[PDB]
Structure 1
Amino acid sequence: AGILFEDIFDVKDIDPEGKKFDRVSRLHCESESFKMDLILDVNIQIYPVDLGDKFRLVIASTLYEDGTLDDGEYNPTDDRPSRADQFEYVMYGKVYRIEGDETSTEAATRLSAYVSYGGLLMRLQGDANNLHGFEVDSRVYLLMKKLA
């Protein structure tokens, strides 16, 4: 598998502070049946998004549908493995911080994983039980698909 996370989100805001960038907007999504807030920057010129949209988000450690990793080297002439091409929007990043709700003695109950997709950041808060697949410095894919 290699699918670290999978959920359906709804868009609540596009730019609460304002339009900071011409071609990039920051979605403020909330989950469904998981109660996990999301803050994602999406290229809107290539992949337009507006309010109220529902998309299915998948965060996977590999794209190859069998388990093997990719080594991070780009190669377009590799259609043989039949990668996960059922999604519309795909990004590739590196998780750089896992904040938590720890203390001196008690362990954490809520985490917050940050991933940087070459500039376009993402924060994914929620419960600490379904967020266990994330380790810092690990390459991560993001896959989106709008539900009609």
Structure 2
Amino acid sequence: AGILFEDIFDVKDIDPEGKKFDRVSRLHCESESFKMDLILDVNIQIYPVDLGDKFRLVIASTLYEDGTLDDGEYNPTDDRPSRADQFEYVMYGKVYRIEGDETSTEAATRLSAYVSYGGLLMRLQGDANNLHGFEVDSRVYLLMKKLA
């Protein structure tokens, strides 16, 4: 098992800067359990989403529940029990920049995660240990499922 982070989520306000595209919305959402903060882009065309919606979030380093890191290239025919089959929303990813900690820090509390999925941006912030494993050049697979 490789859950690099997991959390439940509901949204507070969808787009606070006008609607200035066609296929994307710029989400502003917050966690309840831990005081994290998610800014994320989500294709509303092929995944409609509203304000009051709730959804559980996870961020894996592999979708296999055998936890092996064997990935060459997504082969479309294959099928075997993967972590996706319970969700509703997949996205490949890449983390490229972690900001919040400048110097030799005596209390690294606020650290942010900057991820963009091939063009859709994502900003998550939080502590400085929960959000670890996150090196540079660090592929992750966002997953998500709307929860009641």
Q: TM-score, normalised by structure 1?
A: 0.92
Tell me by how many angstroms 1:136 deviates: 1.5
Distance change (3 Å), C-alpha of 1:39 and 1:70? farther
Provide the identity percentage.
Answer: 100
Distance change (3 Å), C-alpha of 1:112 and 1:72? farther
SS of residue paired to 2:86: coil
1:41, 1:120 within 8 Å by CA — same for their partners in 2? yes
Q: Distance in 2 between matches of 1:83 and 1:16?
A: 33
Name the count of aligned residue pairs. 148
Tell me by how many angstroms 1:13 deviates: 1.5
Q: TM-score, normalised by structure 2?
A: 0.92
Higher normalized strand content (fraction of residues): 1
Distance change (3 Å), C-alpha of 1:121 and 1:105? closer
Farther-moved stretch of structure 1 (35-44 vs 125-134)? 125-134
Distance change (3 Å), C-alpha of 1:70 and 1:22? farther
Q: Distance in 2 between matches of 1:2 and 1:104?
A: 29
1:17-61 CA distance string (max 9 Å, x none) = 111211100110000110100000000001111001110000000
Tell me by how many angstroms 1:66 deviates: 1.2
Q: Distance in 1 between matches of 2:129 and 2:53?
A: 27
Distance change (3 Å), C-alpha of 1:122 and 1:28? same
SS of residue paired to 1:100: coil
Farther-moved stretch of structure 1 (135-144 vs 102-111)? 102-111
1:51-88 CA distance string (max 9 Å, x none) = 01110000000011111225351211110354431100
2:61, 2:140 within 8 Å by CA — same for their partners in 1? yes
Q: Distance in 2 between matches of 1:138 and 1:105?
A: 23
Q: Which runs of 5+ in 2 are unaligned?
A: none
Superposed structure 1 runs of 4+ greater than 4 Å apart? none
Q: Which runs of 5+ in 1 are unaligned?
A: none
SS of residue paired to 1:125: strand
1:60-117 CA distance string (max 9 Å, x none) = 0001111122535121111035443110001011001011234355252221011110
2:84, 2:90 within 8 Å by CA — same for their partners in 1? no
Aligned to 1:128: 128
